[PDB]
Amino acid sequence: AVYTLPELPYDYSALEPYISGEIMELHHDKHHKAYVDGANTALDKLAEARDKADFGAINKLEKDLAFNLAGHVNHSVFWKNMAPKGSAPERPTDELGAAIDEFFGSFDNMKAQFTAAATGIQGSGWASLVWDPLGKRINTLQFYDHQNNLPAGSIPLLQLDMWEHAFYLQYKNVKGDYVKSWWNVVNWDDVALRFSEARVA
Amino acid sequence: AVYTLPELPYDYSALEPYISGEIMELHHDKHHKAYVDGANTALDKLAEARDKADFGAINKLEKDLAFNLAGHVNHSVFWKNMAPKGSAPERPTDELGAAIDEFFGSFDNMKAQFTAAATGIQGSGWASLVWDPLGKRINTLQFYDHQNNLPAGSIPLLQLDMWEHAFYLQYKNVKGDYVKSWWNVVNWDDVALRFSEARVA
Amino acid sequence: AVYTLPELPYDYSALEPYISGEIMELHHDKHHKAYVDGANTALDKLAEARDKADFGAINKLEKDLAFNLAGHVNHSVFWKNMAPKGSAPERPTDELGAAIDEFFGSFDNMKAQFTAAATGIQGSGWASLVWDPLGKRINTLQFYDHQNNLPAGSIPLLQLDMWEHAFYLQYKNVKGDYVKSWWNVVNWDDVALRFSEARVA
Amino acid sequence: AVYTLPELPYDYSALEPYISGEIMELHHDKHHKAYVDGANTALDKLAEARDKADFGAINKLEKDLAFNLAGHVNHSVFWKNMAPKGSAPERPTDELGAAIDEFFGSFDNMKAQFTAAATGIQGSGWASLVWDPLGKRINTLQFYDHQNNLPAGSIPLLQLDMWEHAFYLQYKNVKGDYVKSWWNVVNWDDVALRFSEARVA
Ligand SMILES: [Fe+3]
Ligand SMILES: [Fe+3]
Numbered sequence A, B, C, D: 001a002v003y004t005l006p007e008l009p010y011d012y013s014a015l016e017p018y019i020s021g022e023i024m025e026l027h028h029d030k031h032h033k034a035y036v037d038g039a040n041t042a043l044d045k046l047a048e049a050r051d052k053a054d055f056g057a058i059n060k061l062e063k064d065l066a067f068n069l070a071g072h073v074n075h076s077v078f079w080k081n082m083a084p085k086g087s088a089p090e091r092p093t094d095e096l097g098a099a100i101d102e103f104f105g106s107f108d109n110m111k112a113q114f115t116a117a118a119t120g121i122q123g124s125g126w127a128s129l130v131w132d133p134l135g136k137r138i139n140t141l142q143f144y145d146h147q148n149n150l151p152a153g154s155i156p157l158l159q160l161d162m163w164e165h166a167f168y169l170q171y172k173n174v175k176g177d178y179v180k181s182w183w184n185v186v187n188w189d190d191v192a193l194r195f196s197e198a199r200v201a
């Protein structure tokens, strides 16, 4: 198949007590898996349309592709963006840390803007730290669902899933507590990797 | 300023008779300029938000940034994607042509799928030929407005502005004629360049 | 058929010089007509799905229905909301005028809020004065496309089409001039009728 | 205040075993309350905007109003649409039942179409049985979030909250089981009342 479900780089319960193993298992095995199948199906349907020379359902297929592929992209990044508490540095450093200070003033200011974007979403969405290739800078974006509210070419560096399934079982309606706990499991080494590959554009 | 308006790589009337100089001038000098100014203002407001620790309008600012920056990105690609007819090849060749044949079966099939995506939009939008870095392939996407219906990391190769301001003065409601004419002014050299640089590899 | 294209209550050129006959004809005969067909088709497809017990394309059909039916609703209201310059009162009076003063302070304040909503849309949309049955009041809403950014149960009293096809041929990018000219052709007697039937909820 | 939180017509645990009291309490006391407060704040800000003639955040305020008011409207209908099993009929009858048979063929067909719309949503949303005043019929709509994918004038008769917070704690990702259970607690008397009052006639 064109798309495959990547395995978590850690145990389902490795992110506790910040994110429960219950959520991690349901989130990965159920949710992420669905996006993989949906993205594969969307492409299969588009190829079928081309062969039959009938693009009557093009609007449906393009949304199915964007929604599912974006869901696949976002979650793939999400898993690697995290790691067990004491496994990685608690703060960005080197070029990444410098870039954060340059475009946000400081690490704390970056977190403040990112958190505000994360808890204020009206509906399902994501908070994301991205590399803007045009302006050559790091910005924060607030995705709607998986595929809305973002410029083409945006390269994800750090993403936080704000869909209710990502936190409801543990934090219920208190989104602030979820975001607060999540910072404790962010793998800044992975974010640095994504920044290095993004900046080399 | 963070963002700046790029100059057109040709005269306003250089795309005639396929795209009028009347449209090109309004589209570039007025529309694109507004996106650049809006994107800069969004960043200024976000910086101000970080300074005072007041992210009350974070939802507004994130959409303002996504909408304007996406408009700036989309139009910047749009201008270079075109050139006066004759000054550029009529069909894709080499690696680009081979990739189009691989992911769409043929140039005509890609053209048909892209056209369908362009004319079927329910609202303002774009038809876009992008490089999918996760699936390592070329796909077509149907953007809504400027910043909706697309996965993060999507790299634009060829885009067509389907907002009514891009064709109404000349083609009125007949969007189908607009798309047909547009193919004649596509600069496949520019598309090939973008494809070669997609996900630095 | 379930839906039909209503005729304009006046000549195509009756709204000049505020809105050209060229626009009125294209807008009514081309655009509005498309929504009627699309809404009829959406329902036909849904009935076909029910008979076959296959709702695989339910997401597509529900969007097709909402988009097209909303387009039909919005335009139907739009036409009747207007009349040749000196044919109707230039200001709301009686219960309608009183209600406007009550929920906006004055007629001018209502226009200011309505205009701001009309010219600020990021993409296609509408500015609409509606009757909120729950709060029992008149509010202004900014529709996105035709079917987005509005609560269920909202009863349209006065609507302004801000899609580019509604003004580009005459006012180009200058949206402010279009809205300004449009106020001169608003049929307040029709708005009063819609208010009377809405308030009787 | 303009908007107020309505009390539930039954105890939080009255919908068990179909819908948990745990969900009902959080959903009502926390979620619905937030929409009421948000809708009131939106109106306050709009009034403030009119006072100072500063509509700079008009796009934000119009979305805040649409999102919150739609959430308030949707949930107000949602609560009354349900009642403990047994306390209300298991199937629609009289005029309502006849209308459902007319516009869907049968109660089972309406149920199947509604279910499909409920489980297939790409993001947060609602499945809604509404009265179409233009077509003079009963249709099903698939709302996105609270305020998207619906025509103006749509009158809610029966709605199902498909936001993850409405079922995750009990049904996890199995939205299909949530919908099946939900049918058991539908108060057809309330739906019949809403149908009788749809477009005062
Ligand atoms: Fe998720
Ligand atoms: Fe444009």
Ligand SMILES: [Fe+3]
Binding pocket: C027, C031, C075, C161, C163, C165, C166
């Ligand atoms: Fe229109």
Ligand SMILES: [Fe+3]
Binding pocket: D027, D031, D075, D161, D163, D165, D166
């Ligand atoms: Fe809810």
